[PDB]
Design a protein around this nucleic acid. Sequence first.
RNA 1: AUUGGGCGUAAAGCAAGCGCAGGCGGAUUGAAAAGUCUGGUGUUAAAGGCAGCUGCUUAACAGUUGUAUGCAUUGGAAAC
RNA 2: GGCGAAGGCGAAAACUUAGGCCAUUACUGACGCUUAGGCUUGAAAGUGUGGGGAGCAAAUAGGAUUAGAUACCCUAGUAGUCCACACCGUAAACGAUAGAUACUAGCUGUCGGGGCGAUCCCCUCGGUAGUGAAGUUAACACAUUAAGUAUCUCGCCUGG
RNA 3: GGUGCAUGGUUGUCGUCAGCUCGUGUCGUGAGAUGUUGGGUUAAGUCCCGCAACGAGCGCAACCCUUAUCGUUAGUUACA
RNA 4: CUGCUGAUAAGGUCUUCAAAA
Lengths: 232, 266, 155
Amino acid sequence: GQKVNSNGLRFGINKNWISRWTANSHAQTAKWLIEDEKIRNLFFVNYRNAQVSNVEIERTQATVDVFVYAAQPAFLIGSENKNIQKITKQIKQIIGRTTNLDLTINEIGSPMLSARIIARDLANAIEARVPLRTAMRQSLIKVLKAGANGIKVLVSGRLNGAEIARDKMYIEGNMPLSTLRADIDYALEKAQTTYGVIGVKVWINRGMIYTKGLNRTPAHILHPQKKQPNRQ
Amino acid sequence: ELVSLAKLGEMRTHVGMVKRYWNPKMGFFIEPERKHNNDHFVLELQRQSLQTAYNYVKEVAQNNGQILFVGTKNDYVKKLVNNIAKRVDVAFITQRWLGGTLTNFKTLSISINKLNKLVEKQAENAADLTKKENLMLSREIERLEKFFGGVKSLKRLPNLLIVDDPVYEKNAVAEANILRIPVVALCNTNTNPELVDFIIPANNHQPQSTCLLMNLLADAVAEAKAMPTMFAYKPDEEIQIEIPQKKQITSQRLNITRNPEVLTRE
Amino acid sequence: EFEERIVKLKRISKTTKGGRNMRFSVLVVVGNRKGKIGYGIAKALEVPNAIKKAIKAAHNSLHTIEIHKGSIYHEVIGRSGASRVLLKPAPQGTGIIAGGAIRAIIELAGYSDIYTKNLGRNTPINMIHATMDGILKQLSPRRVAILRNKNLNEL
RNA sequence: AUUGGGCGUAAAGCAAGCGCAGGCGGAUUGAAAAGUCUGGUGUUAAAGGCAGCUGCUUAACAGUUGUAUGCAUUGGAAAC
RNA sequence: GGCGAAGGCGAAAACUUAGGCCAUUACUGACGCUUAGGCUUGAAAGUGUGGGGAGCAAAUAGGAUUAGAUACCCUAGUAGUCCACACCGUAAACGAUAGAUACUAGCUGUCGGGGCGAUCCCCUCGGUAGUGAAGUUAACACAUUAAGUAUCUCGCCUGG
RNA sequence: GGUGCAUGGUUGUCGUCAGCUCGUGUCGUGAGAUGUUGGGUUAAGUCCCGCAACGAGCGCAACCCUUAUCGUUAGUUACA
RNA sequence: CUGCUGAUAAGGUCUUCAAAA
Ligand SMILES: [Mg+2]
Ligand SMILES: [Mg+2]
Ligand SMILES: [Mg+2]
Ligand SMILES: [Mg+2]
Ligand SMILES: [Mg+2]
Ligand SMILES: [Mg+2]
Ligand SMILES: [Mg+2]
Ligand SMILES: [Mg+2]
Ligand SMILES: [Mg+2]
Ligand SMILES: [Mg+2]
Ligand SMILES: [Mg+2]
Ligand SMILES: [Mg+2]
Ligand SMILES: [Mg+2]
Ligand SMILES: [Mg+2]
Ligand SMILES: [Mg+2]
Ligand SMILES: [Mg+2]
Ligand SMILES: [Mg+2]
Ligand SMILES: [Mg+2]
Ligand SMILES: [Mg+2]
Ligand SMILES: [Mg+2]
Ligand SMILES: [Mg+2]
Ligand SMILES: [Mg+2]
Ligand SMILES: [Mg+2]
Ligand SMILES: [Mg+2]
């Protein structure tokens, strides 16, 4: 049957919030809730070739701070910091010139075990007419070789352009979805194929969190150094 | 020589089972029948087969082959195999023969590796075990020891099998035959001679005969690996043995009344 | 260089409590074209895993084949169930006169010139069983000499 | 399905018996030689088939040489 | 469990009568197996003539149930079921397996003759059953009473 | 605007019921079987014995929140 | 412990493929 969202079930217990701010009134709460959505959607739908794993937003009465974790931040940086100013102006237009922007790019360590970029690669391969069995097999084998626990990939839709929708699942390793202690990262993406839309959902297991607390700690960004700038 | 013919006669290693239960293909090892109701054997054939099996197991143990002793039969046979394992460090399976112990050796190798890792972890010890988890780990150790305590030593498929009764170990002899591994056995007039390679016409019901023959094979192994022997090349005063408790001994197969017609009729 | 070729790819299925479980079954013939050939039938949810398991089974079960002048020595009939396959020696030049499962088995075994005919059913697994039985029942002309105390196939 | 199939459950053992004609049939000896095997002879028209060669620009085609099968008679073989 | 080739045969007796098993130092000396055509028998129902008719019961009448009930249930009830003499000649007439002959592991019962002599049990020759390897089969299964290894003869089959 | 019978996403239902499978091995010509059935105990395919099966994954359970007793931290805008 | 208990319009998806990694 239907299952609750893996991220939503674990939020507020073993996962911190992607946007951390306290608005003044109900009128401002909607504007701030929509502007952050616009910024995140921008960073995800465009500038996709940089493998942006996640973007967090942190706002005060008047100051906006953006933390963009990316696997290949060279594409965000551009040639001698060219596209950086373009995305800065895009964000400033999105929120407002009256505020102070503190954009900060962060190179994410051990990218392979991140469901967002795994799903994005899956969707890109699907859209590029790559055969599905080979695509999922190579993604699963590279994810496992990255040194993580089980990964479950569900790819549904008009499969290979067929007129009857199917679904194909590959679980390889233990994926306890009912357990709350487990560190399960879940992402979902849409491959826009010439025959319609394909939905790819990737669950990845990254061990068990044996330290009680609302995170306040990096999650698989720490194995190598996670120090990139563009801030003040 | 190995043993004395009168000693075999006294240990009753020349008596099989009731004439009712016998495989006709084992007529070679039985002399022309007579008023005996328990299928007497031929002592010369007994000694010849025993000598051949002795020579082969001695050659294997000298050339550093790995032999496995399997008895999952009467408690006396279980204790006998345990004592033989104490005498010589051969692998043994006293509990039930697991399906695919040889042909599916990879999975049981995984299980015995897990057993060894758990054993060394418990020996290293930790305060985190507390009481409940320590008890659970101990119980797991007990189960994998009761069912893999004789197999933990080996790391590769054995080079020879020794079976107390091929009829009872039909699974073990089948695995040995499919994997093309030598298997020796103490056939007791009800066994299929084709499955066993080194047939030893013998008794299987007498706790003295089975002990004498099992200890003779163990003596071959122990001489090859160089300790003093136990029964082989020994006089009467050291070959003598006792009959376990719990006129003459009765090797008669009874309880036919527990063989009713299979449930049928409408 | 154990070449392999697919003989049959069936789509078998069972029925469960609602719906059907469908699995692909492959019949693979593996042969080195020098005297070693085996067959393996395997079932799996997907064709690649089915092929892998079938190749594993075929390599696990390999049989030794003896050839005389590139052909089969004497005419034989292999029986397996309701499938009967007749093999007949051929002179050098006719080539393989086999078609289907028999042809796959003969080419992967290494024979050059064989006359064949499927006299019974046309199910690939049973035809392969009959062909293997016919080739395995074959007698070399040295075993018969040893048995009858003749002089190494001399008159 | 003579070479070359089947009849318990898929098409197919008559409801059973007494049985003439037919088919098949224990062991050994002798004779003859109707079947069987083999040698000689006569014939089985020509064309056609297969093998070789020649001529048409090669072929298709034409021509040329060889090439069986059965019957009858006569002479032997005697295992069935 | 017994008998007969099959259908079939069970209160007691008499008369007439058919086949079979075991052992044969006896006799005939291949006289045998199968059998197209032919003849004989062949459950029950059914027919014809004459008897018989207690019980049961097709057809038939009524009461119920039912949407209806010409059926299942109940109360009555003729032919029939019974005998003699003549026909009919069909059955899931089944071991769904034609008959004859030779050979091929074993184990457990039971019935008859014969050998010993309390029963019981042992051996031999046969009948009838169960279990069971080789072997056969598409599988179920058959497996010395074969559906196994083979021969002979007859009958039969060729998609619905 | 049509097509939820071309789809992604989300949801109802069997049902919070206890099931659904896989790898290796073995049996069978094959679909397939074994494990998952058998005996005890549970809400549970929960666990333990048995067992040609040995293991594993999802599901079950626990980890999460709250109510029930108490200790400590703090005493205002509670108490006083 | 034997009441009663009848029916369900037609045609249909659904496996694309292992060549291979
Ligand atoms: Mg249901
Ligand atoms: Mg036919
Ligand atoms: Mg029929
Ligand atoms: Mg009949
Ligand atoms: Mg009939
Ligand atoms: Mg007669
Ligand atoms: Mg006659
Ligand atoms: Mg002519
Ligand atoms: Mg011409
Ligand atoms: Mg009548
Ligand atoms: Mg009326
Ligand atoms: Mg009714
Ligand atoms: Mg009445
Ligand atoms: Mg009338
Ligand atoms: Mg009829
Ligand atoms: Mg009858
Ligand atoms: Mg039987
Ligand atoms: Mg017609
Ligand atoms: Mg729908
Ligand atoms: Mg189940
Ligand atoms: Mg079982
Ligand atoms: Mg179990
Ligand atoms: Mg009613
Ligand atoms: Mg109607």
